[PDB]
Amino acid sequence: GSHMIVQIGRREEFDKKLLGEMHKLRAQVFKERKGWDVSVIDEMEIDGYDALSPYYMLIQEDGQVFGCWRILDTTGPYMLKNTFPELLHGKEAPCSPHIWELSRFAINSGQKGSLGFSDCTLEAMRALARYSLQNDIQTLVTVTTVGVEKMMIRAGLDVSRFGPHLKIGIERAVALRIELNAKTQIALYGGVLVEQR
Ligand SMILES: [Zn+2]
């Protein structure tokens, strides 16, 4: 009713309408960014990875998607391995059921973002790291910018890079590994996450 709702699930679990607002948000963010292998179809940023069984995280507020993130198994194709392999610096692309890739961070930038943005991200990572840890994941990898990298090294996460950042489009982009260990967990939650069964 005025609070934040976060959903995390497989593409198939979300209503064609929510998906359409997610991809519109990604278009509002990524439209005509060059170098990020973007395709906008009918005002929606959607690509072949979306047809590979991704998970999505959506943050909502007053009935609208304000932020979204995509998650891909590293046992299948993912953007670091198959779109941005230069950022690997010749290292091997991870491939494991315990590691996932994040991509397509998109946050509505307008007036109606009622939480902030340093934090919007915080909240997303809290929900994301937990969903991942409960699905036996130890590591998140992603291609993002140097900006988000520092935002994350500052928030305390344990974050390391595969190699030097590179100019992608108008950005300085880098491939990160985000360990979901104790240090991350404590940064995110104030301590070690404990799940009950
Ligand atoms: Zn509410």
Cα of 126 vs centre of ligand 1, distance in Å, is: 19
Is the Cα torsion angle 158, 161, 167, 173 positive or negative in sign? Answer: negative
Residue type, 186: I
Greatest extent of the chain over all pairs of C-alpha atoms, in Å: 49
Tokens of 68: 């979204």
DSSP class of residue 83? T
Rounded to an integer, what distance in angstroms lies between the CA atom of residue 127 and that of residue 145?
21
Beta strands in the chain (DSSP E): 5-10, 40-41, 44-45, 55-61, 64-73, 99-107, 139-145, 158-161, 166-168, 171-179
Ligand 1 center to 108 CA (angstroms):
18
How many Å lie between the centroid of ligand 1 and the Cα of residue 64? 11
Which ranges in the chain belong to alpha helices (H)?
A: 16-30, 79-82, 118-133, 146-154, 182-189
Question: Is beta strand 171-179 parallel, antiparallel or unpaired with respect to 40-41?
Answer: unpaired
Technique used: X-ray
Domains of the chain: 4-190 (3.40.630.30)
Give the phi and the psi of residue 99 in degrees, each rounded to 5: -125, 140
Please tell me the distance between residue 5's alpha carbon and the centre of ligand 1 in angstroms: 7
Q: Give SS3 for 132.
A: helix
